[PDB]
Amino acid sequence: EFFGESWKKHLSGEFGKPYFIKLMGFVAEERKHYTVYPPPHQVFTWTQMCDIKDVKVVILGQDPYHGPNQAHGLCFSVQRPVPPPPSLENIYKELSTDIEDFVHPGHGDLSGWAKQGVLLLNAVLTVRAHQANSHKERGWEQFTDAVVSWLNQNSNGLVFLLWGSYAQKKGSAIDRKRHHVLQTAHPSPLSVYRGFFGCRHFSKTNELLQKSGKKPIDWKEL
Ligand SMILES: O=C(O)c1cccc(CNCCCCNCc2cc(=O)[nH]c(=O)[nH]2)c1
């Protein structure tokens, strides 16, 4: 099924809310007249890869990729055989310098991280083909805020990775006495040298995980 049951159990209170029904209607109408990404079965891939209770790390994105075959419901990720986009190449580049033993998988599919409890959540979960931010402020933001809010209140010692000002705003209210928040610039080439290169978020995450008595992410398990 398209929406993981452990996530549904905790998020179902949102579904009957006025904003959510409206959002579903909006997306449905868009799909009738336009090509909308990701495909219908991949809007909620981020609920399918692990149990909600097993989340260890949260990487917040903004808008899904807007080109053919790119977005598949995990932020920054692209399925085989799609080449990693520039943002993702920069992520892999930082991994290579942050963690010597990291190995580039030769593809852009981040499912391996998702399975380990890395939540790869975009704030806005659909986009009209070729039109960045086309589905902005139509209700997704309230829903993904609800996901972040649940994790904030109902988990312990998560590491939140906030890349770029948009993600920083979205994670502004995270409880920093209960969770860890790491912030830097967005990995896109335009912003990557404003802090992302050298941020060392991946090793830092693993050390923070070990501080909470948790097993680290194998970032090369892709
Ligand atoms: O114009 C600017 O000032 C500017 C500069 C640097 C980054 C940004 C933020 N937008 C970059 C948009 C391209 C990434 N797309 C990759 C991506 C994929 C995904 O799934 N989620 C996400 O947030 N991003 C904006």
Closest protein CA for atom 18 of ligand 1:
76
Whether the CB of 135 sits within 6 Å of ligand 1: no
Q: Could you give the CA distance from residue 176 to residue 3 in angstroms, rounded to a whole number?
A: 29
Sign of CA dihedral 102, 84, 47, 149: positive
Amino acid at 79: Q
Give the pairing type, strands 36-37 and 159-163.
unpaired
Q: Specify the DSSP class assigned to residue 123.
A: S
Taking the domains of the chain in order of start, what are their residue ranges?
Answer: 1-222
Would residue 145 show up in a list of annotated catalytic residues for this protein? no
What separation in angstroms does the CA of 119 have from each of 54, 102, 114, 168?
10, 20, 6, 16
Whether the CB of 122 sits within 6 Å of ligand 1: yes
Query: After which residues are there C–N gaps above 2.5 Å in the chain?
Result: none
Whether the CB of 87 sits within 6 Å of ligand 1: yes
DSSP of 130-169: T-TTTTTTSSHHHHHHHHHHHHHHH-SSPEEEEESHHHHH
> Among 74, 76, 91, which is best to mutate for testing ligand 1, by the most ligand atoms less than 8 A from CB?
76
What separation in angstroms does the CA of 194 have from each of 84, 186, 189, 197, 209?
21, 8, 10, 8, 26
Judged by DSSP in three states, 61 sits in strand
* CB within 8 Å of 101: residues ≥ 6 apart: 220
Tokens of 220: 């090369």
Residue 107: burial class (beta carbons within 10 Å; 0-12, 13-18, 19+): middle
Tokens of 192: 């990557």
Tokens of 163: 């890349």
Residue ranges for the binding site for uracil?
A: 62, 76, 122, 186
Neighbours of 45 (CB within 10 A): 21
Neighbours of 167 (CB within 10 A): 24
Residue ranges for the binding site for dsDNA?
A: 66, 87, 165, 186, 188, 191, 194
What separation in angstroms does the CA of 217 have from each of 11, 68, 210?
26, 30, 10
CATH classification code of 1-222: 3.40.470.10
Q: Could you give the CA distance from residue 98 to residue 173 in angstroms, rounded to a whole number?
A: 28
Asked how this structure was determined, the answer is X-ray
Neighbours of 63 (CB within 10 A): 22
Residue with tokens 């860890």: 180
